[PDB]
């Protein structure tokens, strides 16, 4: 009885790379982070495959953090019989800004231009300085509850202080900005669906997984297709590309989860946010500025012993010091976690004596998510 996961589309090509998921894992199903969280929290496989009810959900990928309500509801309704959920970072990621507007000149957005494009204040390619381009801008955004939206709106919320309105942190872009969507904005579903829409009319721009924002990794450095971010004309400063190398130092500087807080799943997912605000990492001053984590949601406990062992073997690979998934992570435009981070994940969720460890024979005694599906 295969282990079923799915959710976030941002990293789906990583989880679909041969060998990244270990024995017993079904192929990952990309449906969006909102759908992934709902699939896991409610054990609702229809959130993975519409119309299919004869399988259980064992894990999810999400780039949206579990909310206080999601966590409390699971704790009261499910944890007594299924065990604690586990929420852990998988990889670090940039958020790229691909666009469809030809021209040899490099497109390099200042942060304030980025803000203005996504608020609708800047609605022509003329309004991006040095762009070599003219004509209308059409914003494409995610129709559904998206972790890419969450990662991106965290940045807009932290940086966009000079609009006619404010950006809220959300999974639904269509309501992020208090002043509405830009006129003419186009909604699409999934990372891939947005990329298809980006190509379906001239002058379109979006926010996107770095794995989908260009067909090849080097394409992230093609500023005729993927905008640089961080221009400051006053200082004669160029922006840079969303290549993983331009966010890796910042990812690597993020503190491991605080020891005393490790029983709280919320404590495990670092988020970036406003400057000089405890609890959130400031966006980096160097390199590429728009980044965050994509995460995994598992149970500590599975009723079935084989499924439990299979989940542990995946963690042993994904968080291993050796024989790990880091090459595949890089190949999909993402940032591996550092040694210390991997060691911290293992210490809590693998090492047997830890109260948090998957399959702990005391904690998980008699409990766990169920083998058989029953409706």
Architecture of the domain made up of 95-243: 3-Layer(aba) Sandwich (3.40)
What are the structural domain ranges in the chain? 1-94+244-375, 95-243
Contact 243, 221 (CB under 8 A): yes
Q: Do 1-94+244-375 and 95-243 share a fold?
A: yes
Q: Provide the b/e sequence for 269-298 (b: ≥16 CB within 10 Å).
A: bbbbbeeeeeeebebbeebbbbbbbbbbbb
Give strand pairing partners of 187. Answer: 141
Separation of alpha carbons 148 and 96, rounded Å: 10
User: Using CA atoms, how far apart are residues 62 and 80, in angstroms rounded to an integer?
Assistant: 23
**With contact defined as beta carbons under 8 Å apart, do 111 and 103 qualify?**
no
Phi-psi bin for 135: left (phi > 0), alpha (psi -120 to 50), beta?
left
What whole-number distance in Å separates Cα of residue 87 and Cα of residue 75?
13
Q: Specify the pairing of strand 291-299 against strand 85-94.
A: antiparallel
List the beta strands (DSSP E) in 225-290.
228-229, 272-273, 281-282
**Technique that determined the structure:** X-ray
Q: Which two tokens stand for residue 259?
A: 């020891």
Closest by CA position to 85, among listed 44, 37, 48: 37
Identify the three-state secondary structure at position 264.
Answer: coil
User: Is 219 within 8 Å of 198 (Cβ atoms)?
Assistant: no
What whole-number distance in Å separates Cα of residue 330 and Cα of residue 217? 9
CA distance readout (Å), 250 to 212, 270, 272, 309: 22, 12, 10, 34
Query: Tokens standing for 270?
Result: 């670092």
**List of residues 6+ apart from 154 with CB closer than 8 A:** 169, 271, 272, 273, 292
Q: What is the dihedral of CA 297, 301, 305, 306, to 10 degrees?
A: 0
Rounded CA gap, 268 and 88, in Å? 6
Tokens of 202: 């001239």
d(Cα 188, Cα 113) in Å, to the nearest integer?
A: 23
Cα-flanking dihedrals φ and ψ of residue 91, to 5°?
-145, 160
Q: What is the CA radius of gyration of the chain?
A: 21
The b-or-e profile of 340-365 (16+ CB within 10 A means b, else e) is ebbebbbbbbbeeeeebbbbbeebbe
**Distance of alpha carbon 215 from the chain centroid:** 19
**Cα–Cα dist 135/33, whole Å:** 34
Q: Which of 137, 159, 104 is nearest to 291 (CA)?
A: 159
Task: Give CA–CA dist 220/268, Å, rounded.
Answer: 29
Q: How far apart are CA 275 and CA 125, in angstroms?
A: 30
End-to-end CA distance of the chain: 17
> How many Cα atoms occupy the beta-carbon half-sphere of 253 within 13 Å?
14
Structure tokens at 142: 């995610």
Resolution (angstroms) stands at 1.0
For residue 220 the two structure tokens come to: 């992230």
3-state SS string over 160-219?
Answer: CCCCCCCECCCCCHHHCECCCCCCCCEEECHHHHHHHHHCCCCCEECCECHHHHCCCHHH
Contacts of 259 (CB under 8 A, 6+ apart): none
**Arch. (CATH architecture) of 1-94+244-375:** 3-Layer(aba) Sandwich (3.40)
C-alpha 79, offset from chain centre:
25
Report helix, strand or coil for 349: helix
- Of 4, 2, 20, nearest to 328 (Cα)? 20
Distance CA 67, CA 73 (A): 10
DSSP 283: P
Find, among 150, 176, 188, the residue nearest to 65 by Cα.
Answer: 150
Label residue 117 left, alpha or beta by phi (over 0 means left) and psi (-120 to 50 means alpha): alpha
Q: Are the beta carbons of 128 and 236 closer than 8 angstroms?
A: no
CA distance 181 to 190: 19
Tokens found for residue 2: 């295969």
Q: Distance between CA atoms of 86 and 345, rounded to whole angstroms?
A: 10
Residue 315: both structure tokens together? 């963690």
């Amino acid at each position: 009885m295969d282990i079923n996961g799915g959710g976030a589309t941002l990293p789906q090509a990583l989880y679909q790379t041969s060998g990244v998921l270990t024995a017993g894992f079904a192929q990952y199903i990309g449906v969006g982070s909102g759908n992934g969280k709902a699939a896991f929290l409610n054990n609702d496989y229809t959130k993975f495959q519409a119309g299919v009810t004869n399988k259980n959900v064992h894990w999810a990928g999400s780039d949206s953090k579990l909310s206080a309500t999601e966590l409390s509801t699971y704790a009261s309704a499910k944890q007594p019989t299924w065990g604690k959920l586990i929420q852990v970072p998988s990889v670090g990621t940039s958020v790229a800004i691909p666009f469809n507007k030809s021209g040899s000149a490099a497109v390099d957005l200042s942060v304030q231009e980025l803000c203005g494009v996504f608020s609708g204040r800047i609605n022509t390619w003329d309004g991006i300085s040095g762009s070599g381009r003219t004509g209308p801008i059409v914003v494409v955004y995610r129709s559904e509850s998206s972790g890419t939206t969450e990662l991106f709106t965290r940045f807009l919320n932290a940086k966009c202080n000079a609009e006619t309105g404010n950006f809220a942190v959300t999974t639904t872009f269509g309501t992020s900005f208090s002043g509405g969507l830009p006129a003419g904005a186009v909604a699409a579903t999934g990372s891939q669906g947005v990329m298809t829409a980006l190509a379906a009319g001239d002058g379109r721009i979006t926010y996107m997984s770095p794995d989908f924002a260009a067909p090849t990794l080097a394409g992230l450095d093609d500023a005729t297709k993927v905008a640089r971010v961080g221009k400051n004309v006053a200082t004669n400063t160029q922006g840079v590309s969303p290549a993983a190398a331009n966010v890796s130092a910042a990812i690597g500087a993020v503190p491991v989860p605080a020891a005393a807080d490790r029983s709280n799943p919320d404590a495990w997912v670092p988020v970036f946010g406003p400057d000089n605000t405890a609890g959130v990492q400031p966006y980096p001053t160097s390199g590429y500025p728009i980044l965050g984590f994509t995460n995994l949601i598992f149970s500590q406990c599975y009723a079935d012993a084989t499924q439990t062992t299979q989940v542990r073997d995946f963690f042993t690979k994904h968080y291993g010091a050796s024989n790990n998934n880091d090459a595949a992570i890089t190949a999909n435009a993402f940032v591996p976690l550092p040694t210390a981070w991997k060691a911290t994940v293992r210490a809590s969720f693998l090492t047997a004596s830890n109260a948090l460890s998957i399959g702990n024979t005391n904690v998980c005694n008699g409990i766990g998510r169920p083998l058989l599906e029953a409706a």
